[PDB]
Curated annotation (Swiss-Prot), chain B:
Disulfide bonds listed in the record: none
Record note on quaternary structure: Interacts in a tissue-specific manner with ACE2 in small intestine and with CLTRN in the kidney. Interacts with CLTRN; this interaction is required for trafficking of SLC6A19 to the plasma membrane and for its catalytic activation in kidneys. Interacts with ACE2; this interaction is required for trafficking of SLC6A19 to the plasma membrane and for its catalytic activation in intestine. Interacts with ANPEP; the interaction positively regulates its amino acid transporter activity.
Section covered of the full-length record: 345 to 416 of 634
Protein name: Sodium-dependent neutral amino acid transporter B(0)AT1
Gene source species: Homo sapiens
Tissues and organs where the protein is expressed, per its UniProt entry: Robust expression in kidney and small intestine, with minimal expression in pancreas. Also expressed in stomach, liver, duodenum, ileocecum, colon and prostate. Not detected in testis, whole brain, cerebellum, fetal liver, spleen, skeletal muscle, uterus, heart or lung.
From Swiss-Prot, chain C:
Binding site for substrate: R10
Organism lineage: Eukaryota, Metazoa, Chordata, Craniata, Vertebrata
Sugar-bearing residue positions: N59
Outcome of substituting R10Q: Complete loss of enzyme activity. Does not affect amino acid transport activity of SLC6A19
Stated consequence of mutating T61P: Increases slightly the interaction with RBD domain of SARS-CoV-2 spike protein
Effect listed in the UniProt record for changing Q62P: Increases slightly the interaction with RBD domain of SARS-CoV-2 spike protein
Record comment regarding domains: The extracellular region of the ACE2 enzyme is composed of two domains. The first is a zinc metallopeptidase domain (residues 19-611). The second domain is located at the C-terminus (residues 612-740) and is 48% identical to human collectrin. The cytoplasmic tail contains several linear motifs such as LIR, PDZ-binding, PTB and endocytic sorting signal motifs that would allow interaction with proteins that mediate endocytic trafficking and autophagy.
Organism: Homo sapiens (Human)
Name listed for the protein in its UniProt record: Angiotensin-converting enzyme 2
Function comment: Essential counter-regulatory carboxypeptidase of the renin-angiotensin hormone system that is a critical regulator of blood volume, systemic vascular resistance, and thus cardiovascular homeostasis. Converts angiotensin I to angiotensin 1-9, a nine-amino acid peptide with anti-hypertrophic effects in cardiomyocytes, and angiotensin II to angiotensin 1-7, which then acts as a beneficial vasodilator and anti-proliferation agent, counterbalancing the actions of the vasoconstrictor angiotensin II.
Location of the protein in the cell: Cell membrane; Cytoplasm; Cell projection, Cilium; Apical cell membrane
Length: 340, 72, 68
């Protein structure tokens, strides 16, 4: 990383045309201007700040997989809650443990230790604000042109006369006195944009709701009260009755889609997705396509699908529709005609 | 158990109020949305009626708390 | 996670199109202008010989030119 740190501020020197005209490339017709550097720090924020939590978790997700604290039914499980926790991004389609979208990148698919970017990132910002004021040329601040400025490189030469004579935090203290690291020069060069995040982002909403999805709307909360229909002396609901249910949920789609939609699509109990299992047999659920799992069933047809076979499932567990709560689906029946 | 969700076995007219303290301790936010209907005998014995309602809108209710409710 | 400009959400620099008050002026536009300036793998070092002596830091020799 260290090498990358000084090398990509030298690939910055590859990206500048200032010594290119004084090492013998194209003549200037493109002289620079003034204002941009108050809004250029915005552009650095989309690059250098946008990649910090994303590249952190994927190495941390890889390690607990690698040391075996994550069983092999939990990869896409462990992939997304940390993207909801650390990044606060969400998947647009729920993923089972087949897809392995972590493998879609370059360096995971081709075996790179991806923590090389964090070390170089830390040493890089401790250096630049402490040194290149004396780089003998500063118009635009990214033009700290040590090419034709020897004086700044000799404070840099205290690390440069060394190979692997020792660690690097002694090479850090040869320059800026760093001993482990500091996040402060990250925070200092974004300190003009820390308060500016209360200038154009003054209007305050803090944090996020850490569980929203754009497919959470199609999930249905079902609410079972065994102390309401069977009451006591009833059977104790456990993971079998979880497994009984999803079979009998899958029932309702087959009975719907051929008596109403009138074509056959198959359904397993595993298509009934279970989320937030609670003792009170309460949980929000939704069903997908069988193995076109990129697409899910729209809830608007599931609402009429339950109302067709609502009478089928309460006696499938000796219940009374006040122990089959759906919160959006309610029984609409019962006109009496007792007198002749 | 609506908002704060205990297992249905480990809740009764009991440490319900004590587990409510653990519910308010685990979270006060959802605890500020669960309204509870306080009740008492002599808050149910304190209502009454005279003249006509005792047999017409009072006795017929407990008539309907019988297994042979149309017979009595 | 499909609205970040890239495929996997690393660099959000192509979201600098609706999130700006201003900002302009590009960097080097000469990315292929060395291709037809034709400095080969040792003329780039003969020119970078003059790059770091103006920084004062030394240049590389002994294998840097010879065997390659």
């Amino acid at each position: 990383g260290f090498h990358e740190a000084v090398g990509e501020i030298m690939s910055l020197s590859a990206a500048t045309p200032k010594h290119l005209k004084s090492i013998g490339l194209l003549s200037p017709d493109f002289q620079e201007d003034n204002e941009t550097e108050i809004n250029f720090l915005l552009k650095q924020a989309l690059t250098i700040v946008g990649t910090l939590p994303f590249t952190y978790m994927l190495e941390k997700w890889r390690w607990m997989v690698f040391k075996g604290e994550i069983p092999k039914d939990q990869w896409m499980k462990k992939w997304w809650e940390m993207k909801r926790e650390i990044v606060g991004v969400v998947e647009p389609v729920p993923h089972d443990e087949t897809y392995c979208d972590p493998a879609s990148l370059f360096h995971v698919s081709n075996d790179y230790s991806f923590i090389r970017y964090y070390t170089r990132t830390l040493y890089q910002f401790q250096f630049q604000e402490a040194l290149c004021q004396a780089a003998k040329h500063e118009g635009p601040l990214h033009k700290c042109d040590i090419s034709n400025s020897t004086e700044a490189g000799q404070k840099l030469f205290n690390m440069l006369r060394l190979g692997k004579s020792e660690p690097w935090t002694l090479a850090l203290e040869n320059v800026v006195g760093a001993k482990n690291m500091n996040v402060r020069p990250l925070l200092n060069y974004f300190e003009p944009l820390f308060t500016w995040l209360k200038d154009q982002n003054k209007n305050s909403f803090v944090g996020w709701s850490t569980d929203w999805s754009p497919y959470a709307d199609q999930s249905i909360k079902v609410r079972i009260s065994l102390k309401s229909a069977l009451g006591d002396k009833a059977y104790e609901w456990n993971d079998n009755e979880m497994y009984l249910f999803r079979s009998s949920v899958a029932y309702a789609m087959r009975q719907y889609f051929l008596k109403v939609k009138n074509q056959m699509i198959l359904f397993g109990e595993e298509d009934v997705r279970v989320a937030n299992l609670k003792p009170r047999i309460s949980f929000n659920f939704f069903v997908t396509a069988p193995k076109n799992v990129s697409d899910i069933i729209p809830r608007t047809e599931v609402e009429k699908a339950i109302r067709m076979s609502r009478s089928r499932i309460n006696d499938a567990f000796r219940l009374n529709d006040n122990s089959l709560e759906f919160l959006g689906i309610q029984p609409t029946l019962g006109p009496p005609n007792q007198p002749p | 158990i609506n908002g704060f969700d205990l297992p249905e076995g480990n809740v009764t007219q009991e440490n319900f109020v004590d587990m409510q303290q653990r519910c308010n301790a685990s979270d006060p936010a959802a605890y500020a949305q669960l309204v509870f209907q306080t009740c008492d005998i002599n808050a149910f014995l304190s209502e009454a009626v005279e003249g006509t309602g005792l047999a017409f809108i009072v006795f017929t209710e407990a008539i309907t708390k019988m297994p042979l409710s149309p017979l009595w | 996670a499909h609205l970040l400009g890239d495929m996997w959400g690393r660099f959000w620099t192509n979201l600098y199109s609706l999130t700006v008050p201003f900002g302009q002026k590009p960097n080097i536009d000469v990315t292929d202008a060395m291709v037809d300036q034709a400095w080969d793998a040792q003329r780039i070092f003969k020119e970078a010989e003059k790059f770091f002596v103006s920084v004062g830091l030394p240049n590389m020799t002994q294998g840097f030119w010879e065997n390659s």
